[PDB]
Amino acid sequence: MLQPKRTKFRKMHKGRNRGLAQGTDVSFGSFGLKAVGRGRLTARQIEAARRAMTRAVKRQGKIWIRVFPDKPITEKPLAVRMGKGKGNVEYWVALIQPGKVLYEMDGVPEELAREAFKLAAAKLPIKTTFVTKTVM
Amino acid sequence: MFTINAEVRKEQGKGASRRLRAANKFPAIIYGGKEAPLAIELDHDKVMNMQAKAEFYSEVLTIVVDGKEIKVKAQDVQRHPYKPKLQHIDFVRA
Amino acid sequence: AKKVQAYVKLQVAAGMANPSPPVGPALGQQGVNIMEFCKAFNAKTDSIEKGLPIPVVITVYADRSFTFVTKTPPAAVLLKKAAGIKSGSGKPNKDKVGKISRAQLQEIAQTKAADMTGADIEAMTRSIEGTARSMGLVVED
Amino acid sequence: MALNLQDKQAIVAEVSEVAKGALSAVVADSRGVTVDKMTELRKAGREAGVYMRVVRNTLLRRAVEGTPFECLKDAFVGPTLIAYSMEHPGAAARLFKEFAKANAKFEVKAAAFEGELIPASQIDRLATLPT
Amino acid sequence: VVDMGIRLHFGSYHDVDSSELAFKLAASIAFKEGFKKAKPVLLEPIMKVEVETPEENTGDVIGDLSRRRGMLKGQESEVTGVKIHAEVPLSEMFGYATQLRSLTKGRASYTMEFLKYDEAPSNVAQAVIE
Amino acid sequence: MKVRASVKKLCRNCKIVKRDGVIRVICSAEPKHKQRQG
RNA sequence: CCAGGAUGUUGGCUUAGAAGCAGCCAUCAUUUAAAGAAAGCGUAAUAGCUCAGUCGAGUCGGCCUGCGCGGAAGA
Ligand SMILES: [Zn+2]
Numbered sequence: 001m002l003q004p005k006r007t008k009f010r011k012m013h014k015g016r017n018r019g020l021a022q023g024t025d026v027s028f029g030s031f032g033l034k035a036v037g038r039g040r041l042t043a044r045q046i047e048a049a050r051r052a053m054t055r056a057v058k059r060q061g062k063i064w065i066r067v068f069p070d071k072p073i074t075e076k077p078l079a080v081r082m083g084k085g086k087g088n089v090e091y092w093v094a095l096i097q098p099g100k101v102l103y104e105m106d107g108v109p110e111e112l113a114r115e116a117f118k119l120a121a122a123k124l125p126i127k128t129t130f131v132t133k134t135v136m
Numbered sequence: 137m138f139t140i141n142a143e144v145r146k147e148q149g150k151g152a153s154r155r156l157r158a159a160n161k162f163p164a165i166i167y168g169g170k171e172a173p174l175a176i177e178l179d180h181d182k183v184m185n186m187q188a189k190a191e192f193y194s195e196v197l198t199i200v201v202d203g204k205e206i207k208v209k210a211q212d213v214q215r216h217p218y219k220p221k222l223q224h225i226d227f228v229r230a
Numbered sequence: 231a232k233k234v235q236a237y238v239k240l241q242v243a244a245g246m247a248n249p250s251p252p253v254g255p256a257l258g259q260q261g262v263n264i265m266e267f268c269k270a271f272n273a274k275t276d277s278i279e280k281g282l283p284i285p286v287v288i289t290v291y292a293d294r295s296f297t298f299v300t301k302t303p304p305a306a307v308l309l310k311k312a313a314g315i316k317s318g319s320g321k322p323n324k325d326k327v328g329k330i331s332r333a334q335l336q337e338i339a340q341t342k343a344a345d346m347t348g349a350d351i352e353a354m355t356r357s358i359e360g361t362a363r364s365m366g367l368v369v370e371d
Numbered sequence: 372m373a374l375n376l377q378d379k380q381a382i383v384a385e386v387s388e389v390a391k392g393a394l395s396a397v398v399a400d401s402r403g404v405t406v407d408k409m410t411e412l413r414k415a416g417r418e419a420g421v422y423m424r425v426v427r428n429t430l431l432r433r434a435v436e437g438t439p440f441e442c443l444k445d446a447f448v449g450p451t452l453i454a455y456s457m458e459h460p461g462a463a464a465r466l467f468k469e470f471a472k473a474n475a476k477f478e479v480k481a482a483a484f485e486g487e488l489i490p491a492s493q494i495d496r497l498a499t500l501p502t
Numbered sequence: 503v504v505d506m507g508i509r510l511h512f513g514s515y516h517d518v519d520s521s522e523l524a525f526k527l528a529a530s531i532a533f534k535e536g537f538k539k540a541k542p543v544l545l546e547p548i549m550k551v552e553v554e555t556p557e558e559n560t561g562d563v564i565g566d567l568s569r570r571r572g573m574l575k576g577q578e579s580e581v582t583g584v585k586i587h588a589e590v591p592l593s594e595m596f597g598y599a600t601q602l603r604s605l606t607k608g609r610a611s612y613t614m615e616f617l618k619y620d621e622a623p624s625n626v627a628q629a630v631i632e
Numbered sequence: 633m634k635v636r637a638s639v640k641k642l643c644r645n646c647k648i649v650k651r652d653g654v655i656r657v658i659c660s661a662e663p664k665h666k667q668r669q670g
Numbered sequence: 671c672c673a674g675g676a677u678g679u680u681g682g683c684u685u686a687g688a689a690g691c692a693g694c695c696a697u698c699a700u701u702u703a704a705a706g707a708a709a710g711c712g713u714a715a716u717a718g719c720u721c722a723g724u725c726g727a728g729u730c731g732g733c734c735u736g737c738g739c740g741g742a743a744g745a
Contacts (some may be wrong), residue, residue, distance in 0.1 A: 232407070238716070239689095255584070306681075347419075350419060350505060364681065364697080365695090406674090413674090427703075577685095636741090653739075653740085
C-alpha cells in the first residue's frame, strides 16, 4: 500500500478537513479522476482503486496518484477503557477536499478512460467526477 | 473573432460577486496598457460555451462593453471548485 | 436467379476427384451422391487441367441427379502458382513478407469469363489485386 | 442518419446534369424483385453490370424539375425506378420489356424517348420496333 | 520407456573391475539420468472413432465429440445415418460409450480401434508424477 | 428473477418499465435478465 | 411499419474446419439511395437469422438544475 517510509513523528492529532482542494487540474496526463465529495482515503481504498483502473486498461497507458495517505490513524481495540494513552496506528488515510484530482491517466482513448475510472470510483467512499486536461 | 457582450460592474467585493454567480453571471477584470482596470460581468452560459474551445485561449478576444470593442486576451481563469462552471477570468488589452 | 434451393461448396483441389478424408460424404448428404462427383464433375474437368480448387453450386429438385454448372474458381488459388510462393508468410505485417506486381496476376485474373462485374478492363482487372497485397505483400504496380 | 445540405445539393445536381444529356429515361415499378434479377437486368443492358437504378419520386422530381421537363409527375407515384441512356441508341427499351416478360404493361408507367413523352401503351410500340 | 535411440561415445576401464556386472550397472544410471534430463512428457493412446447416429442425432454426436477434446476428420453418410470419424484420447473416451447411447436411446453405436500414441495435455502431465 | 436495488439493461433487448411503482427489467431473449426492485 | 440489407470473397495466414461473427492481421475495392472484408445470437464448418421506396413534420441525447422513485425489514 501507500504510506510514508519514514515520519518525524509516529502519531498525530485529529486534524479537521476544512476548505477546498488544491490539485484541481491535470498536469501529468490527458485524463483523470476528480473528487467531488468530502472525506478521507485509506491506503486500502487508494490501492484497490488503482488496481481497478490499471486492470481495465490491461497493461497500456500510464496512471498517476496525485493523492497520498501521509496521515496515521490510531484506534483502540475492544475491551479497553478510555484514555490510558493514545491508540495505536492501524492505517493511514488522506484528507480529500472537494476538487482533489484523485487519479490521472494517459495513453488511452477517452472512452476507455471513463470505464476505467468507473470501476475504480466504485471502490472509493466519496463521489467522483471524470475530468479532461484543459489548456491554461 | 469571439464577441463577448459585457457590462461595467456597479459594485465590487465578494458579496456582489456571489450575487452574480446566483444569476448566471461571474466577475471579471480587464487590465493592461496605460488604461485603468475595469470591472466586468460576463454571462455564465455564453462564456461557458466559448471557453470550451481552445481557440478562446489562443486567439484574441473582442469584448463589447458600453458600445466599445476592446481587443483583449485570456490571461488566467478560475474554475469552480468541482462543478463545470467559471468564477473569474482575467483579460489583458492586446 | 430465383431463391434458396441447396448450393453448398466444399472442395480442396481440382485434382482430387471425389475425395474422402477432406470432405467425402460431406459433399453429398442431402441430394448429392458420393460417387457421381466424377461423372458430371469430371465431365470436362480432365479435358482441361486438374490442380485448381474449383467449387460449384448444387441445385437439387427431386430428379435424383443434379444440374450443377461449374464456374470460375477462387482467385486465391492463383497465389500459389501464379503469384509466387504457395505459403510461408513468416510474420503478418512485422515484415513486408513477399511482394506481387502489376504484370503479375494481370492476365491471370483476365481469363475469368464467367464472373466479375463490369466489363471495364481496368476496374474489374484491379479488383483481383487487392488481396494479393492484403497478406502483407508489397504492391509493385 | 441523414445527408447534410451541401451533400444533398450535389446528389440532385448530378442526376440533373445527366438528365440533360440522357437520350432516354424510362420509369417503371420494381417491387418484389431480387438482386439476382436486378443484376441480370444490368448485365443484359450493359456488360458493365450498371443499369436500372432506383430513386425516390422527390430526388427525381426536383431532378426532372431542375431541368426543363414537364408532365411526368404521374410517372412518380410510390415505388419508382429510372433507366436512362447517356450513350448509344435509346432503343434499349426492348431489353427491359422482355425482361419483365409481363403480358400487361402497368408496371412500366411511362418514359421519355428523345425528349418526347410516352405513356404506358407505347412501351410495346418501341419494344416492337425493327432493327 | 519407448521410442528412443541411445548412442555410446566414450568411456574407460579400471584397476580391478571391468566386468559384465560392472558395465551392466554403468548403463543403468546413464539412462535414468538422460530420460529425466531430456524434457519428459506423457504419451496417451488416440483412438479412431466411427459414430453412427441416426441422420437426426448426427449433429448431436459431432458436438459431443468436439467437447471431448477430439478432432473431427470428416463425417461419412451411411444409409439414413452418419458416420463420424475422429481422434480422441482413450483417456478422454471416458464414458463416451454411455454418453453416446444416452443421446440416442441406443440409436447410435460405435466402434473403437487403436491408432497411435501422442503427447499428453500439460494439465494431465502434472497429475501423473507421484 | 433476481431482485436487487441495482437494475440495469444487460443486453440490447432489455427494457426499464415501471409497474405500480417498482422498476422492472423485462426480457424476451434471456429469462435470466429478469429483474425487480430498482 | 412495410422495405431492401448484394458482389470480388469461402479476404490472406493458421486449423479438423473458420466463410463478417475462435484467433492473428489487413480493412482496399465495388455496383449505389446505402451495405462494415462486419454489431449480437446462432453453425461441427455452411445455412438461418439481421444492426449499421412509401408515409409526411417531427425526431435524437449529453450538460446544469427543481421536485420525486427504488435502495428501506423488529418485536
Ligand atoms: Zn434482457
